[PDB]
Design an enzyme around this catalytic site. Structure first.
Site, PDB file in Angstrom:
ATOM      1  N   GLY A   1       6.653   6.266   6.311  1.00  0.00           N
ATOM      2  CA  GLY A   1       7.886   5.513   6.287  1.00  0.00           C
ATOM      3  C   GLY A   1       8.820   5.810   7.436  1.00  0.00           C
ATOM      4  O   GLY A   1       9.833   5.117   7.583  1.00  0.00           O
TER       5      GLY A   1
ATOM      6  N   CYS B   1       8.376   5.251  10.486  1.00  0.00           N
ATOM      7  CA  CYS B   1       8.275   4.228  11.518  1.00  0.00           C
ATOM      8  C   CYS B   1       9.577   3.449  11.625  1.00  0.00           C
ATOM      9  O   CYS B   1      10.039   2.853  10.648  1.00  0.00           O
ATOM     10  CB  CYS B   1       7.106   3.294  11.192  1.00  0.00           C
TER      11      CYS B   1
ATOM     12  N   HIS C   1       5.122  -3.864  14.174  1.00  0.00           N
ATOM     13  CA  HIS C   1       4.072  -3.635  13.188  1.00  0.00           C
ATOM     14  C   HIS C   1       4.502  -4.059  11.789  1.00  0.00           C
ATOM     15  O   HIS C   1       3.660  -4.110  10.885  1.00  0.00           O
ATOM     16  CB  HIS C   1       3.681  -2.151  13.204  1.00  0.00           C
TER      17      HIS C   1
HETATM   18  C1  LIG Z   1       2.632  10.316   8.278  1.00  0.00           C
HETATM   19  N1  LIG Z   1       3.346   9.683   9.379  1.00  0.00           N
HETATM   20  C2  LIG Z   1       3.878  10.241  10.464  1.00  0.00           C
HETATM   21  N2  LIG Z   1       4.437   9.307  11.210  1.00  0.00           N
HETATM   22  C3  LIG Z   1       4.237   8.159  10.567  1.00  0.00           C
HETATM   23  C4  LIG Z   1       4.722   6.836  11.070  1.00  0.00           C
HETATM   24  N3  LIG Z   1       4.017   5.689  10.450  1.00  0.00           N
HETATM   25  C5  LIG Z   1       4.638   5.017   9.399  1.00  0.00           C
HETATM   26  O1  LIG Z   1       5.736   5.397   9.031  1.00  0.00           O
HETATM   27  N4  LIG Z   1       4.010   3.959   8.833  1.00  0.00           N
HETATM   28  C6  LIG Z   1       2.805   3.587   9.282  1.00  0.00           C
HETATM   29  N5  LIG Z   1       2.203   2.529   8.660  1.00  0.00           N
HETATM   30  C7  LIG Z   1       2.878   1.718   7.719  1.00  0.00           C
HETATM   31  C8  LIG Z   1       2.315   1.598   6.467  1.00  0.00           C
HETATM   32  C9  LIG Z   1       2.960   0.799   5.521  1.00  0.00           C
HETATM   33  C10 LIG Z   1       2.744   0.477   4.186  1.00  0.00           C
HETATM   34  N6  LIG Z   1       3.731  -0.359   3.838  1.00  0.00           N
HETATM   35  C11 LIG Z   1       3.929  -0.968   2.530  1.00  0.00           C
HETATM   36  N7  LIG Z   1       4.601  -0.650   4.841  1.00  0.00           N
HETATM   37  C12 LIG Z   1       4.125   0.074   5.880  1.00  0.00           C
HETATM   38  C13 LIG Z   1       4.648   0.162   7.183  1.00  0.00           C
HETATM   39  C14 LIG Z   1       4.002   0.979   8.088  1.00  0.00           C
HETATM   40 CL1  LIG Z   1       4.634   1.099   9.698  1.00  0.00          CL
HETATM   41  N8  LIG Z   1       2.153   4.242  10.311  1.00  0.00           N
HETATM   42  C15 LIG Z   1       0.830   3.817  10.805  1.00  0.00           C
HETATM   43  C16 LIG Z   1       0.944   2.972  12.053  1.00  0.00           C
HETATM   44  C17 LIG Z   1       2.157   2.412  12.431  1.00  0.00           C
HETATM   45  C18 LIG Z   1       2.224   1.650  13.574  1.00  0.00           C
HETATM   46  F1  LIG Z   1       3.398   1.101  13.963  1.00  0.00           F
HETATM   47  C19 LIG Z   1       1.108   1.426  14.344  1.00  0.00           C
HETATM   48  F2  LIG Z   1       1.228   0.667  15.451  1.00  0.00           F
HETATM   49  C20 LIG Z   1      -0.107   1.957  14.000  1.00  0.00           C
HETATM   50  C21 LIG Z   1      -0.159   2.724  12.851  1.00  0.00           C
HETATM   51  F3  LIG Z   1      -1.367   3.255  12.507  1.00  0.00           F
HETATM   52  C22 LIG Z   1       2.769   5.320  10.927  1.00  0.00           C
HETATM   53  O2  LIG Z   1       2.231   5.917  11.833  1.00  0.00           O
HETATM   54  N9  LIG Z   1       3.571   8.345   9.422  1.00  0.00           N
END
Ligand SMILES: Cn1cnc(Cn2c(=O)nc(Nc3cc4cn(C)nc4cc3Cl)n(Cc3cc(F)c(F)cc3F)c2=O)n1
Ligand SMILES: Cn1cnc(Cn2c(=O)nc(Nc3cc4cn(C)nc4cc3Cl)n(Cc3cc(F)c(F)cc3F)c2=O)n1
Lengths: 299, 305
Positions: free
Chosen positions: A142, A144, A40
């Site tokens: 973050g 992820c 992702h």
């Molecule tokens: C609150 N929470 C609980 N677990 C998570 C895990 N998670 C994450 O850490 N980040 C995500 N989205 C990103 C946004 C970004 C913005 N920037 C600048 N870079 C980013 C990188 C990421 Cl990964 N997401 C959402 C998400 C991540 C995926 F890998 C996916 F396949 C679907 C999704 F909806 C996330 O869930 N956050």
């Protein structure tokens, strides 16, 4: 004593890196000369809802991936995609690479999670793969890329890489080969977890631990068969109990002198009649995130 | 999303764990620079465990009687000294993995991460709190004596606890890194009672604030109270009295959630008098008192270490 205990995180802390593709930032796993991270990362804000990862990756070059191991910069010399995991070959092999293995765990088995943010660890906790193929963890924005692992004699068995948070607050991820746990897909879309069941064999192991730790009020004078317990278990949304579970619970039955099917009878009563009040091993609930092996190791 | 008992990353402490052997009595030690800190009960034998004269036991010990193993590497003891209940062994080699560190004495109610070690090898990490009776409810087996407790504040490891003994009541007791025991306990194999423990009130309130941050808000009520009237109810339920400092420590959490402390106290007053009626809070059917207000900030709206 009996507490939820996680494996030491040192061997995993030295494999965590930050991966940046444009503005999109995540965590990655640095093993030997390859950095494993969720694919992702190649998505931008407008690609997150419905991504074509094959098309997104074909337009990317090695110089589009920024990998930072703290202040140290690593040069990407190759990129590839295995299922939902991106693999970035780097110029330098991680000197702190531990003996490792990539394993796919089954529901009920537990693992330790190192919650990381921007490549830097933040905390370690223990959690289990729920039967609905989700995990109840503590993850923020973050997270992820954070990994889940078990350590057996200096060998770290990597089993989970965090990907996304589900609408119900539970979390979903993949193994270290990119294949998701459960029917989930790496897209920013509402994906429901499903009705979860209780890991029965783990609940019994926790009841055995309570006997070992003094709490023995739940112990009754009844016994049952595996079939009659599974009949009662199904009604209260409990996982079926197999002969394998009975055999694994052997050591715990030996130390306590309480037969497995008698402990099943005590759990059957706790479910049919209730708990009214009171606590067991410091909880007013029945805990299902302790495997039989975790209980033996601690008790 | 979610809230779990979270311990600090253990890497910096794992590289300071060594095995200390005095004749045959085997323990764990903390290797920081050229000093190995370890519990002084290591100089006791099976006939010395009940009432030892440590000054005389050490007077009969020499540097070559202390075997310290840092993994597969052997360390040469070049000096020995005793500070309160802690033995300090100077070694020939300074620990290359020594992190930036401090020795702190925590107060009852504050939490720390424990790295349970056995024969110099770490085995697991968990979080626990210094109970008001100055004991800790941990998971320790035989050989755990020497395991340390710590907090990490942005690359500085604040060592605050070293495990010594299991008390008859099943709880655990230890010292700071200067040898001074937490509580009225003594390093000898005698029956020592801990004392009646109370519930850390401020920690329960912080845990309720954490649930508000994470969605659980069914307990938030329509009532308020004063500190005095709550403490009347608190004392009844074996809760620690609530001070103005506790209120001020809960300041940050109250702002983020928009719920005043005395309003949260009223909801806790109701939860204490009425119960939880099956319902769950943050995945628990009981009221947790092992989460400090700082732990919630660390986990909810917090990051790296
Ligand atoms: C609150 N929470 C609980 N677990 C998570 C895990 N998670 C994450 O850490 N980040 C995500 N989205 C990103 C946004 C970004 C913005 N920037 C600048 N870079 C980013 C990188 C990421 Cl990964 N997401 C959402 C998400 C991540 C995926 F890998 C996916 F396949 C679907 C999704 F909806 C996330 O869930 N956050
Ligand atoms: C089950 N459990 C839970 N916590 C503990 C901690 N603990 C421990 O690990 N070891 C202890 N006794 C030793 C015996 C030894 C045998 N050999 C060869 N070497 C030994 C070294 C020790 Cl320390 N004890 C008992 C104990 C240790 C003390 F430091 C003390 F001051 C009084 C005590 F009664 C112990 O509690 N075990």
């Amino acid at each position: 004593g009996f507490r939820k205990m996680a494996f030491p995180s040192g061997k995993v802390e030295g494999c965590m890196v930050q991966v940046i593709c444009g503005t999109t930032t995540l965590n990655g796993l640095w093993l030997d000369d390859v950095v494993y991270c969720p694919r992702h990362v190649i998505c931008t804000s407008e690609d997150m809802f419905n991504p074509n990862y094959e098309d997104l990756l074909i337009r990317k070059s090695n110089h589009n991936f920024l990998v930072q191991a703290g202040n140290v910069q690593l040069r990407v010399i190759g990129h590839s995609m295995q299922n939902c995991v991106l693999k970035l070959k780097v110029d330098t092999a991680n000197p702190k690479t531990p003996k490792y293995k990539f394993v796919r765990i089954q529901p009920g088995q537990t693992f330790s999670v190192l919650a990381c943010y921007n490549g830097s660890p933040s905390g370690v906790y223990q959690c289990a793969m729920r039967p609905n193929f989700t995990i109840k963890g503590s993850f923020l924005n973050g997270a992820c890329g954070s990994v889940g692992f078990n350590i057996d004699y200096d060998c770290v068995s990597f089993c989970y890489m965090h990907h996304m948070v589900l609408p119900t607050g539970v979390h979903a991820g993949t193994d270290l080969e990119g294949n998701f746990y459960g029917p989930f897909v790496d897209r920013q879309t509402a994906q429901a977890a499903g009705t979860d069941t209780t890991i029965t064999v783990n609940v019994l192991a926790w009841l055995y631990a309570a006997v070992i730790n003094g709490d023995r009020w739940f112990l009754n004078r009844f016994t049952t068969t595996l079939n009659d317990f599974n009949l009662v278990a199904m009604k209260y949304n409990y996982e079926p109990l197999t002969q394998d579970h009975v055999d694994i619970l052997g050591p715990l039955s030996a130390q306590t002198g309480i037969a497995v099917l008698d402990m099943c009878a005590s759990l059957k009563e706790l479910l049919q009649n209730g708990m009214n009040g009171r606590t067991i091993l410091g909880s007013a609930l029945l805990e299902d995130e302790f495997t039989p092996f975790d209980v033996v190791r601690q008790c």
